[PDB]
Amino acid sequence: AGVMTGAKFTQIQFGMTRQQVLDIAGAENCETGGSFGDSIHCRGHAAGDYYAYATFGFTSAAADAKVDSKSQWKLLAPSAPTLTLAKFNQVTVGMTRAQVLATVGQGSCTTWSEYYPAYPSTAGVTLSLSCFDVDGYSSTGFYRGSAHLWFTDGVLQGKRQWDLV
């Protein structure tokens, strides 16, 4: 098909230029402007009420700006999801990302959004992870047991779960 994919999302790197993003994503998949501002938004397969997608944010509107933000929905699948409600309840704010992953399972999560507000400095990096129980991830419809875990500077600031058992 050649639409936006998780492989392409992983290939696109923080620091890349707009033209690099377009080349890797496939320009026909992508758009800018409108509600996306100077970000580049690239669509994949149909999912939910709207396509799997990536959104790439840039340090400025300049043609030479760099990727400072990556967000994706239904492009990445967890490698070995093992999240449970019991495991989720052991997570606590103030844990590092490594501590969270050791609690919920190293392969339970995907990166929902990752943003460097001072790129190339990593100070203030925000990270949203989506984590899934063994049968929770879906690339096309609703999750069947999932959690949102959000971090600043690698430290958990909050969490929410839906339908974990």
């Binding site: 509600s35 970000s39 149909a46 009420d49 709207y50 929902w112 609703f142 949102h148």
Partner: protein, 263 residues
């Protein structure tokens, strides 16, 4: 023929293995063609039209409401929020949240509209205020999309939704400026290319809102401006018996092709 529309809608429904609901209002002569027009269907994301309209109605009295900044916090992100996530730890206005709910089906945006209205009951109370006694929004995103057969939560009928969409986009349920705002947003929808729009003449202008949920529920509601005749309103609802059924935007496009032959 009129008979062909009914036979072909029934054949489409049968071949799809689901339950199809259609309502087409022709405002030239106040006619309305129905298929399961009085059966309830899960609205899923099409309910965002009524939430945005209810906030528009509020802005007729609170005249600066659409410019109110609303904080977007990580805790507000749900499962799907492509515009809100761009503004997390910042603000969006209620106008931006309305547009995001309508044009991208952003679920955080929808929940901010619902919260502004005092809960799902605020959306439903607005429906009652404009004479819709059928519509009911009972839950927030994402659970309003569970689409359980026989569950009346978050349902309406094709007849009721076509009438209400007509009043909102072509009639006087809203002030003239608010009606223009709503129609502008709907004409800018980005989610509908494979649904009703894919079954209509390309020269016709369409404003629509899709919906999707469990039970392979696949919906679209549209206001349509053909060249050379009065506008139309078309509702296409589709849902299936298995909770994990795949969405079928192609069934809505087919329903649009079929019912347009009766014009």
């Amino acid at each position: 023929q009129t008979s062909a529309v009914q036979q072909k809608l029934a054949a489409l429904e049968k071949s799809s293995g689901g339950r199809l609901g259609v309502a087409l209002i022709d405002t030239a002569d106040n006619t309305q063609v129905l298929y399961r027009g009085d059966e309830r269907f899960p609205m899923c994301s099409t309910s965002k039209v009524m939430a945005a309209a209810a906030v528009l109605k509020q802005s007729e009295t609170q005249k600066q409401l659409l410019n109110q900044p609303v904080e977007i916090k990580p805790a507000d992100l749900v499962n799907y929020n492509p515009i809100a996530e761009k503004h997390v730890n910042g603000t969006m206005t209620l106008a931006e949240l309305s547009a995001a709910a309508l044009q991208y089906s952003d679920n955080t945006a929808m929940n901010k509209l619902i919260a502004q209205l005092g809960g799902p009951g605020g959306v439903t109370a607005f429906a009652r205020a404009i004479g819709d006694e059928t519509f009911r929004l009972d839950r927030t995103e994402p659970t309003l999309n569970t689409a359980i057969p026989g569950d009346p939560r978050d349902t309406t009928t094709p007849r009721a939704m076509a009438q209400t969409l007509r009043q909102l986009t072509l009639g006087h349920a809203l002030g003239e400026t608010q009606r223009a705002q709503l129609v502008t947003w709907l004409k800018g929808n980005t989610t509908g290319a494979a649904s009703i729009r894919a079954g209509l003449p390309t020269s016709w202008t369409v404003g629509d809102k899709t919906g999707s949920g469990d039970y392979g529920t696949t919906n679209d509601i549209a206001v349509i401006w053909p060249q050379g005749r009065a506008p139309l309103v078309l509702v296409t609802y589709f849902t299936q018996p298995q909770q994990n059924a795949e969405s079928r935007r192609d069934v809505l496009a087919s329903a649009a092709r079929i019912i347009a032959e009766g014009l």
